[PDB]
Write an enzyme that holds these catalytic residues in place. Sequence first.
Site, PDB file in Angstrom:
ATOM      1  N   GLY A   1       0.861  -1.166   0.000  1.00 59.02           N
ATOM      2  CA  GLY A   1       0.000   0.000   0.000  1.00 59.02           C
ATOM      3  C   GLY A   1       0.897   1.214   0.000  1.00 59.02           C
TER       4      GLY A   1
ATOM      5  N   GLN B   1       3.608   9.804   2.023  1.00 52.86           N
ATOM      6  CA  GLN B   1       4.884   9.122   1.849  1.00 52.86           C
ATOM      7  C   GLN B   1       5.634   9.578   0.608  1.00 52.86           C
ATOM      8  OE1 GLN B   1       2.963   5.032   2.556  1.00 52.86           O
ATOM      9  NE2 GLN B   1       5.158   4.806   3.065  1.00 52.86           N
TER      10      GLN B   1
ATOM     11  N   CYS C   1       7.221  -1.195   6.043  1.00 47.20           N
ATOM     12  CA  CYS C   1       6.753   0.077   5.535  1.00 47.20           C
ATOM     13  C   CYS C   1       7.814   0.589   4.572  1.00 47.20           C
ATOM     14  CB  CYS C   1       6.522   1.075   6.687  1.00 47.20           C
ATOM     15  SG  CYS C   1       5.954   2.695   6.142  1.00 47.20           S
ATOM     16  N   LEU C   2       7.383   1.101   3.418  1.00 45.91           N
ATOM     17  CA  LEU C   2       8.382   1.605   2.500  1.00 45.91           C
ATOM     18  C   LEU C   2       9.122   2.827   3.048  1.00 45.91           C
ATOM     19  CD1 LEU C   2       6.462   1.186  -0.843  1.00 45.91           C
ATOM     20  CD2 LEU C   2       8.237  -0.242   0.097  1.00 45.91           C
TER      21      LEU C   2
ATOM     22  N   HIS D   1      -2.789   0.289   8.430  1.00 46.79           N
ATOM     23  CA  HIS D   1      -1.429   0.789   8.268  1.00 46.79           C
ATOM     24  C   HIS D   1      -1.401   2.028   7.397  1.00 46.79           C
ATOM     25  CE1 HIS D   1       3.036   0.054   7.737  1.00 46.79           C
ATOM     26  NE2 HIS D   1       2.760   0.935   6.784  1.00 46.79           N
ATOM     27  N   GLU D   2      -2.141   2.012   6.280  1.00 41.97           N
ATOM     28  CA  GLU D   2      -2.104   3.185   5.403  1.00 41.97           C
ATOM     29  C   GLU D   2      -2.892   4.346   6.001  1.00 41.97           C
ATOM     30  OE1 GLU D   2      -0.008   3.349   3.178  1.00 41.97           O
ATOM     31  OE2 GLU D   2       0.523   1.215   3.146  1.00 41.97           O
TER      32      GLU D   2
ATOM     33  N   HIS E   1      -0.842   6.463   8.225  1.00 39.70           N
ATOM     34  CA  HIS E   1       0.007   7.482   7.585  1.00 39.70           C
ATOM     35  C   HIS E   1      -0.702   8.833   7.464  1.00 39.70           C
ATOM     36  CE1 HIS E   1       3.678   5.460   6.624  1.00 39.70           C
ATOM     37  NE2 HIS E   1       3.052   4.459   6.035  1.00 39.70           N
TER      38      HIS E   1
END
Lengths: 174, 174
Positions: free
Chosen positions: A49, A54, A102-103, A144-145, A148
């Site tokens: 995702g 980000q 996580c990226l 998770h997204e 952010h």
Amino acid sequence: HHHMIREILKMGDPRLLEVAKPVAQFDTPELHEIVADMFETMHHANGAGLAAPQIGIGLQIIIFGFGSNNRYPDAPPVPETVLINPKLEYMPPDMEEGWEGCLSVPGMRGVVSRYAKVRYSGYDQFGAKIDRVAEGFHARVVQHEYDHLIGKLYPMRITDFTRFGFTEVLFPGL
Amino acid sequence: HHHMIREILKMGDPRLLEVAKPVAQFDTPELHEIVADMFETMHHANGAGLAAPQIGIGLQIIIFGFGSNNRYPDAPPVPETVLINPKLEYMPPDMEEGWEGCLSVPGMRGVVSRYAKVRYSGYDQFGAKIDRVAEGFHARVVQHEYDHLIGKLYPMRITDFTRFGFTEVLFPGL
Ligand SMILES: [Fe+3]
Ligand SMILES: [Fe+3]
């Protein structure tokens, strides 16, 4: 002009701690470009995702979904989704622990407790309404997204820092 | 039979969570070799200190100190020390926050609260007694390396995860 893929901001950048602003208008050329750039960035990095902050865009836009993902080989298919101005409902009391990465935290994984099930609603990039109940990994990605968008990164959710470390040690086969 | 520098274990390796055993015999050839390998590994990596569990040796041995250190360029000189079977005394209530890294957590820094002052005692590799009071960064590195002997890594000590991230973002010049 030559196109450049958008870079992912790494933890430590203060932009990842901000609270994203709502999207006021749907179906604009600029919004279609943002979504294309997000999928390009997410796919190149094998993301599950991605949230717009980000890539330095302070807007309530998340994308997610894949058939298979080789950073999360145990994850089942997740519906490819663009979710704008999301509203989540957590469904207590059932929680599940799972390894997350996580990226914006390259090279690491940690165990995070998430709701087993959530409701989420919002809009796609055309302005159509989305309203779903998600469970398991689908629910985990959405949480998770969403985090952010409210300035939260998964180490903030960890309670057991004995289960946090580098992917190449924790998951060498990966 | 070529010598190989000992590699530093990365967080996620379960050996870093163990509680190290005391050294039973001082001034042995084996102990002098362990100390030599630790200094070799620490210096090559620009370490401020190193604990034996970080190179896979489950013993209560820490080393630390430098005239200058380029991973902690603001740190003052710290006496070069081999400290075996350490006993620490924390001195409440004065605490100090500071940015810490760790060779077992490459590429990151986080803010950690430490005692401003500690007492520490133990033995050198010859078996001679050491007994000192340390302050500031000297006290910080001794606390940080001692933590490695009781299975603690600095993300376990962090309380403010808005001040944890990648060194290249937090401290670009480094
Ligand atoms: Fe993430
Ligand atoms: Fe360390």
